[PDB]
């Protein structure tokens, strides 16, 4: 309800709001929360930049899937 | 007091890093921000603020602004 | 694979740290290049069973894993 109150800010740094998962050392899965520049969500999107990940997929899941799948990423 | 509003909030977030789901420490935050209601209401509804800028074009009046 | 997905990393692991073939195939060159006497009594059985060609002592669905928690 208190956040129902309050969507609007929510829905102003939905686009920008990044987020994601780290085994970080309690070994529980952490949700960590961080700023994205609007620019990073801007050029990741248009260019090179989004052929360069399908390019990237294409080269993990016909050549890793494995030990180094986290680590070519 | 803005700037300061950050680094308050900023502990906040630097106290729940370590959450579990219903984890203690966080379900006292939202136990604060229930008990703080209205009250953090208003710093949330500070921010409606460019935001209204459209609301200028609108009826302006001489290019610079002024309405 | 996927069993062994639930540990982080983990199937890669199962199939080097854990059965990873081979090393049935060094143990078979253990047991062959081991005198008859000087056996333990889990390579003995294996020794046995091997030359009954029964084939039972090869992990099957069960693993270390599966057997524990």
Not at chain 2, 22 to 38: H, T, Y
Not at chain 2, 46 to 58: N, T
Not at chain 3, 12 to 34: D, V
Request: contains cysteine.
């Amino acid at each position: 309800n208190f956040l129902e109150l309050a969507e609007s800010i929510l829905e102003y740094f939905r686009p920008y709001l990044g987020r994601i998962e780290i085994m970080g050392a309690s070994r529980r899965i952490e949700r960590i929360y961080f700023e994205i520049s609007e620019t990073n969500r801007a050029q990741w999107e248009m260019p090179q930049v989004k052929e360069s990940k399908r390019q990237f997929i294409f080269d993990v899941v016909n050549e890793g899937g494995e030990a180094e799948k986290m680590e070519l990423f | 007091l803005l700037d300061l509003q950050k680094d308050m909030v900023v502990m906040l977030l630097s106290l729940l890093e370590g959450n579990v789901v219903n984890g203690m420490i966080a379900r006292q935050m939202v136990d604060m921000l229930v008990e703080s209601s209205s009250n953090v209401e208003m710093i949330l509804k500070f921010f409606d603020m460019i935001v209204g800028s459209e609301a200028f074009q609108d009826y302006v009046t001489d290019p610079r602004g002024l309405i | 694979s996927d069993y062994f997905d639930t540990t982080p990393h983990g199937f890669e692991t199962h199939t080097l740290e854990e059965h990873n073939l081979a090393n049935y195939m060094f143990f078979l060159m253990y047991l062959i290049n081991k005198d008859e006497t000087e056996h333990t009594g889990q390579e003995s059985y294996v020794w046995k069973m091997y030359q009954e060609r029964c084939w039972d002592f090869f992990p099957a669905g069960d693993c270390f894993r599966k057997q524990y928690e």
